[PDB]
Amino acid sequence: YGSWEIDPKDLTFLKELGTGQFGVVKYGKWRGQYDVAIKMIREGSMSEDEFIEEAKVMMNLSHEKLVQLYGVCTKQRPIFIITEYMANGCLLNYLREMRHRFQTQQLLEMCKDVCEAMEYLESKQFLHRDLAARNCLVNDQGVVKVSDFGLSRYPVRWSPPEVLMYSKFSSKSDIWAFGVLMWEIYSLGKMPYERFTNSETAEHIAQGLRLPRPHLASERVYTIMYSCWHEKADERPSFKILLSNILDVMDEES
Amino acid sequence: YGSWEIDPKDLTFLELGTGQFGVVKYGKWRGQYDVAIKMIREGSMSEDEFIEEAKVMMNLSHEKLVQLYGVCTKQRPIFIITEYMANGCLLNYLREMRHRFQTQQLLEMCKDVCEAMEYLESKQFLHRDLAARNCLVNDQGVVKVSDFGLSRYKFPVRWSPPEVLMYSKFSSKSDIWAFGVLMWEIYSLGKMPYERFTNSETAEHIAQGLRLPRPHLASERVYTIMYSCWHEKADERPSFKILLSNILDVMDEES
Numbered sequence: 242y243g244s245w246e247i248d249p250k251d252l253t254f255l256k257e258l259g260t261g262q263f264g265v266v267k268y269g270k271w272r273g274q275y276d277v278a279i280k281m282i283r284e285g286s287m288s289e290d291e292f293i294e295e296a297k298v299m300m301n302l303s304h305e306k307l308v309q310l311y312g313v314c315t316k317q318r319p320i321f322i323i324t325e326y327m328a329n330g331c332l333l334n335y336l337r338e339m340r341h342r343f344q345t346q347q348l349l350e351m352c353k354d355v356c357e358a359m360e361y362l363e364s365k366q367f368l369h370r371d372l373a374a375r376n377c378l379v380n381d382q383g384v385v386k387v388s389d390f391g392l393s394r395y396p397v398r399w400s401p402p403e404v405l406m407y408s409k410f411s412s413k414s415d416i417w418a419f420g421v422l423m424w425e426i427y428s429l430g431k432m433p434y435e436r437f438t439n440s441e442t443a444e445h446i447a448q449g450l451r452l453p454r455p456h457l458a459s460e461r462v463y464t465i466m467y468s469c470w471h472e473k474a475d476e477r478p479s480f481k482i483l484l485s486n487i488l489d490v491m492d493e494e495s
Numbered sequence: 496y497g498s499w500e501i502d503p504k505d506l507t508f509l510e511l512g513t514g515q516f517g518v519v520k521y522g523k524w525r526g527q528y529d530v531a532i533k534m535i536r537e538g539s540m541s542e543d544e545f546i547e548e549a550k551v552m553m554n555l556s557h558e559k560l561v562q563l564y565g566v567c568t569k570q571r572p573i574f575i576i577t578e579y580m581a582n583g584c585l586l587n588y589l590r591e592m593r594h595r596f597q598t599q600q601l602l603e604m605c606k607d608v609c610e611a612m613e614y615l616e617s618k619q620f621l622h623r624d625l626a627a628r629n630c631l632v633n634d635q636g637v638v639k640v641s642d643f644g645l646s647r648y649k650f651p652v653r654w655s656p657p658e659v660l661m662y663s664k665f666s667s668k669s670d671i672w673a674f675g676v677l678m679w680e681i682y683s684l685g686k687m688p689y690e691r692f693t694n695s696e697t698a699e700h701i702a703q704g705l706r707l708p709r710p711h712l713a714s715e716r717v718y719t720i721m722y723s724c725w726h727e728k729a730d731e732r733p734s735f736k737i738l739l740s741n742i743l744d745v746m747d748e749e750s
């Protein structure tokens with residue numbers, strides 16, 4: 242893959258952070274000077290072609306609020322993926338572990354960080370398959386960033402109208418999820434619809450039920466997350482507009 | 496994978512076509528049984544993808560479904576053996592025999608595809624690409640669908656919008672629309688849907704509420720079936736259990 246291929250002997254496995262479906266992440270050090278995260282992909286988790294597309298996306302996309310790629314080790318099995326290390330780890334556990342210790346003005350900065358990354362992927366026609374607090378990482382300075390792994394891109398004469406319409410306004414799925422994310426941040430890791438099941442939630446949202454307003458979220462902040470929860474997808478805002486609305490509130494409140 | 500394991504030497508590679516995941520050839524088992532062989536590429540699928548595909552191939556069976564004869568998992572490229580379809584694709588079969596069909600044969604074909612889908616519907620399986628080009632015909636003129644590359648019905652209910660949850664509840668209604676157009680291909684003798692419109696014009700043509708015109712070979716009652724498959728509201732469309740329910744009724748009426 243060129244310069245992206247790194248030397249394995251320069252790595253050093255030290256600790257374990259977690260395990261996923263497409264491998265296991267392990268904490269290490271690059272040349273014993275910088276902290277990095279290393280993911281060990283399983284032999285049969287993904288196909289060859291699937292890795293070329295996934296990799297091709299990680300090298301061509303770059304944003305300050307996206308998990309930076311340090312390199313990969315495709316010259317061995319299992320293959321590695323070296324990236325920057327996030328000291329604080331997951332955002333969900335971060336909101337619950339360090340709960341109510343950061344003031345409200347910091348909560349909105351977390352939404353801005355995620356909105357900045359999504360706005361970038363939006364400009365590149367990329368969709369987050371699972372946008373939620375559990376899929377966001379926090380670094381030492383409290384910056385929230387999303388990942389590039391597992392991203393998506395965006396029969397005509399045999400497909401129904403429901404499929405055609407979705408193929409043109411599918412980007413609005415990441416907007417609804419983002420709205421529920423702000424709810425998780427301002428609720429400090431509260432699970433959406435705690436008093437409802439999966440079947441219930443699907444029925445309540447269909448009837449118009451929306452998440453309450455976090456007590457730590459101002460009435461204007463609620464307008465942002467609530468703007469993302471519009472029945473008509475085309476009536477929902479874009480990540481560029483949401484970023485402007487978030488920045489607008491930050492200036493008026495801070 | 497057990498008894499499903501076939502000896503690559505027992506099969507002889509006597510070519511039929513090629514797909515994304517590999518190429519399909521023609522052969523015979525022990526010089527006595529006819530079957531088709533699929534040589535999947537090395538990097539097209541993953542180990543987990545195959546195990547799921549196979550697990551679905553070996554656990555499903557239906558007369559109108561492509562029967563699986565076996566696989567060769569101790570070989571690279573991995574092989575998948577199935578029954579041989581003398582007449583091959585349905586679209587080419589409708590165009591090569593356009594002058595050699597009866598009105599009862601056309602409706603019989605539609606049943607052969609509906610009977611298969613009805614079985615898939617009961618097992619919660621979905622055909623991602625249901626069309627005449629993905630259907631095969633054996634020597635006796637019986638149509639059969641394939642179960643390779645199917646999908647079942649993750650979506651986080653708590654973070655998904657309504658259009659996604661509503662899609663997961665009416666996912667089988669999408670194949671109904673495709674089935675309705677399939678019947679048009681049959682009674683139209685292989686004509687391309689919206690042959691006089693482009694991909695962008697077809698999408699708008701459906702948005703305006705217009706649909707395919709009735710083929711002259713289809714009767715008023717048969718067209719009502721395929722037309723019922725094309726309803727703006729997915730919930731208002733019938734089910735494959737109901738389509739077969741009707742197709743048989745029009746058969747007895749016109750037979």
Ligand SMILES: Cc1nc(Nc2ncc(C(=O)Nc3c(C)cccc3Cl)s2)cc(N2CCN(CCO)CC2)n1
Pocket residue numbers: 258259266278279280308322323324325326327328329330331378387388389390
């Ligand atoms: C799960 C976890 N992640 C951490 N930081 C990460 N940085 C980079 C990671 C990563 O997975 N990148 C990546 C991606 C995104 C895709 C493909 C490939 C790769 Cl390599 S993960 C830290 C952490 N700890 C901190 C919070 N607790 C401290 C209390 O002791 C405990 C746990 N936990």
Ligand SMILES: Cc1nc(Nc2ncc(C(=O)Nc3c(C)cccc3Cl)s2)cc(N2CCN(CCO)CC2)n1
Pocket residue numbers: 511512519531532533561575576577578579580581582583584631641642643
């Ligand atoms: C493309 C083609 N298929 C033919 N029969 C097949 N039987 C089994 C096939 C197969 O694909 N199974 C399968 C599936 C479904 C999934 C995964 C894996 C597998 Cl293995 S295909 C015959 C044929 N010929 C007949 C019609 N023409 C001569 C007229 O004189 C020429 C062409 N052409």
